[PDB]
């Protein structure tokens, strides 16, 4: 078997490709104590005993000796394989630094000694999930809207939003203690299940402001302790920061980003608006679809075909879709194995995996 | 059990304040006194967190310090100034000895040459008056200043029920190895020996979990109870231990020991230790007394995990009779060089019994 592993910015998933779905999820997270590393859910459990690392917190690799400890973790204790004995296909970010391409290569030959390897860029395997070649896509828990034209990203049409699920959790705890409740402490983790839980975007802001403004028929409780508390507006406002960041002090919101189409050959616009493609625990706001759909059209040509494709299965499209290419019969000659390792080095990785 | 310890003088608050500094980062506490996030046991000097202490000019510097959140030069003057407040002081020390669970014991913190000389003398007494099952520790520090220093050794050797550290000592070591050239530089090094000469207090342990119990082990007769201190990190146990017993380190400006306590605050093997003390026996480093059978003890312990290898020495010397000497020496030329004046000629009087006590002590035939 295959492994497939999707490097998260908040959260890893890890699984055998074939499969439907990961086997494994975990938080990207490296902690020693304040039993010497402890990696995943264990470190999140035990954080209070010790001091917490991210080393893939903004989608790059930051802290390498912290990311082998996670695909060490990966391996043996997730999936409890033994990564020498299966070929390996990885995710990376958009716009990933070269060197930083070069150096996951050298560590999965060298240190995990793998048969063999390959990494995808992330919204790539998203639009392969969606069965698509061509297209515009990813909103994740730490960070882009990624033009994919025959199979190929295309860099210089990228764009990064330094704006994603975790911003908006701090958000809504903001404004829940700003309704007169109070949450502050790591909390955070209740709100960010209340964000999931109970919160859309709305089609028209002003419009469902004034709605809450003048009845209950927002409101949704929610049970902490025992105690049962409301959320109203707040379940519109928290995701409406992603069509207008100023709400959080940042000044493009989502559907004025994805700017990136402007940015491709005009005889390929067309086939990006017709194909905007969501992905990203980020985009499962209910009414997201919808609204993107709105304000696009609101900003392309009148005489524009516009089309937002929300799949169910989204959150984990990059996982899926690593598992449909792996399982690939013409991808089978495209992983770098051990043999052309041996041959060529790490840069081997610009030509084999472009 | 708990302790309460009490500060008196310049010297007292200072080394006292940097006591409690160098405790409250050992464990998770800030110094505003909240618990920080970040198994030891710390209900012993805390009162749940707050320190059980009792300070008595230099109180402005600390109140102006980042702390504030944690609470003449006669003897006569000193003795006499504590008969007028005998009450108020005492009213203080009474609902901090009753509002904690099970009393024990009574720190105390103070150098014996100009207040806390006489105060510090006075309170001595009444503290044994009003509880006779109560220890005092005195952690006295050494430097009209002969006449001082002996009128409180006088109350040292029949109320205290138990440690020297002399400043002649302290600079030496400041020179040698600190290059030094200051008050506030010395009271790094004296700090860093109190908060681990009770290293078996904050932390549970297998034996000498009681403050009774690291005074009876040293203390073989009330009269001689005056220790020293040795400290050598400024490898294995052999290392720690045979540079404990230079002369270099000792705290202490025929002669033999009575008893030694040895602790290791690292990691280390707990198989080694029996095979260093053998080595011990062999190159024979440490004579010790003829009369009683008498024998060396090692502790381990565990540094704090919020704050490697160290070691401390608690050894009951009998070479420290040389010290009192020095301070008798020097009275009676002052005696001759000048409303009865008859209360020093008794403190010199019995001071002299201990002296002849220790150099009676290293006989093979003390007993009588």
């Known amino acids: 078997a295959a492994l497939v592993v999707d490097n998260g910015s908040g959260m890893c998933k890890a699984g055998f490709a074939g499969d439907d779905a990961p086997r494994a999820v975990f938080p990207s ?33 930051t802290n390498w000796d912290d990311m082998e400890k996670i695909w060490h973790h990966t391996f043996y204790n997730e999936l409890r394989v033994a990564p020498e004995e299966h070929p390996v296909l990885l995710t990376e970010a958009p716009l990933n630094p070269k060197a930083n391409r070069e150096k996951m290569t050298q560590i999965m030959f060298e240190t995990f000694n793998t048969p063999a390897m390959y990494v995808a860029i992330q919204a790539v395997l998203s639009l392969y999930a969606s069965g698509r070649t061509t297209g515009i896509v990813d909103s994740g828990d730490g960070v882009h809207t990624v033009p994919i034209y025959e199979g190929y990203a295309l860099p210089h049409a990228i764009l990064r939003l330094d704006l994603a699920g975790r911003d908006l959790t701090d958000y809504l705890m903001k404004i829940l203690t700003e309704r007169g409740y109070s949450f502050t402490t790591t909390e955070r983790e209740i709100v960010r299940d209340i964000k999931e839980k109970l919160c859309y975007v709305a089609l028209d802001f002003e419009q469902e402001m004034a709605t809450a403004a003048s009845s209950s028929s927002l409101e949704k409780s929610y049970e902490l302790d025992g105690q049962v508390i409301t959320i109203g507006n707040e379940r519109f406002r928290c995701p409406e920061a992603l069509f207008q960041p100023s709400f959080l002090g940042m000044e493009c919101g989502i559907h004025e980003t994805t700017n990136s189409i402007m940015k491709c050959d005009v005889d390929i616009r067309k086939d990006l608006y017709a194909n905007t493609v969501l992905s990203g625990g980020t985009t499962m706001y209910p009414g997201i679809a919808d609204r993107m759909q709105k304000e696009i059209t609101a900003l392309a040509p009148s005489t524009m075909k516009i089309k937002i494709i929300a799949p169910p299965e989204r959150k984990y499209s990059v996982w899926i879709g690593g598992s449909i290419l792996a399982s690939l019969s013409t991808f089978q000659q495209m992983w770098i194995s051990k043999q052309e390792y041996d041959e060529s080095g790490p840069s081997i990785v610009h030509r084999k995996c472009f | 059990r708990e302790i309460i310890t009490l500060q008196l003088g310049q010297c007292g608050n200072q080394i006292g304040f940097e006591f409690w500094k160098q405790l409250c980062a050992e464990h998770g506490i800030s110094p505003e006194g909240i618990v920080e996030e970040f198994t030891d046991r710390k209900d012993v000097f805390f009162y749940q967190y707050i320190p059980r202490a009792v300070l008595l000019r230099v109180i402005h510097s600390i109140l102006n310090s980042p702390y504030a959140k944690l609470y003449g030069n006669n003897w006569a003057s000193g003795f006499s100034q504590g008969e007028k407040i005998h009450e108020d002081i005492f009213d203080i020390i009474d609902r901090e000895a009753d509002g904690s669970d099970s009393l024990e014991g009574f720190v105390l913190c103070h150098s014996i040459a100009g207040t806390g000389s006489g105060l510090g003398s006075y309170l001595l007494e009444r503290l044994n008056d009003r509880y006779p099952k109560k220890l005092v520790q005195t952690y006295s520090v050494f430097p009209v200043q002969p006449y001082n220093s002996l009128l409180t050794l006088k109350r040292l ?192 009087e019995i001071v002299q019994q201990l002296i002849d006590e220790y150099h009676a002590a290293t006989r093979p035939d003390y007993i009588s």
Not at chain 2, 261 to 274: K, Y
Not at chain 2, 296 to 307: E, G
């Open chain 2, 157 to 348: 050797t029949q109320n205290a029920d138990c440690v020297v550290l002399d400043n002649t000592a302290l600079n030496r070591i400041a020179t040698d190895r600190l290059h030094i050239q200051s008050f506030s530089q010395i009271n790094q090094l004296v700090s860093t020996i109190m908060s681990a000469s009770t290293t078996t207090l904050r932390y549970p342990g297998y034996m000498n979990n009681d403050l009774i119990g690291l005074i009876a082990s040293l203390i073989p007769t009330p009269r001689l109870h005056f220790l020293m201190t040795g400290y050598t990190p400024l490898t294995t146990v052999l290392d720690v231990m045979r540079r404990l017993l230079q002369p270099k380190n000792v705290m202490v400006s025929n002669h033999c020991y009575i008893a030694i306590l040895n602790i290791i605050q690292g990691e280390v093997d707990p198989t080694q230790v029996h095979k260093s003390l053998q080595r011990i026996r062999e190159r024979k480093l440490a004579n010790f007394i003829p009369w009683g059978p008498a024998s060396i003890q090692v502790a381990l312990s565990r540094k704090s995990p919020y704050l490697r290898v160290s070691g401390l020495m608690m050894a009951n010397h009998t070479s420290i009779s040389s010290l009192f000497e020095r301070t008798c020496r020097q009275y009676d030329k002052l005696r001759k060089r000048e409303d009865n004046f008859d209360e020093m000629d008794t403190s010199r």
């Open chain 1, 29 to 61: 997270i490296v902690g020693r104590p304040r039993k010497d590393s402890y990696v995943g859910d264990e470190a999140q459990s035990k954080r209070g005993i010790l001091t917490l690392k991210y080393p893939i917190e903004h989608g790059i690799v």
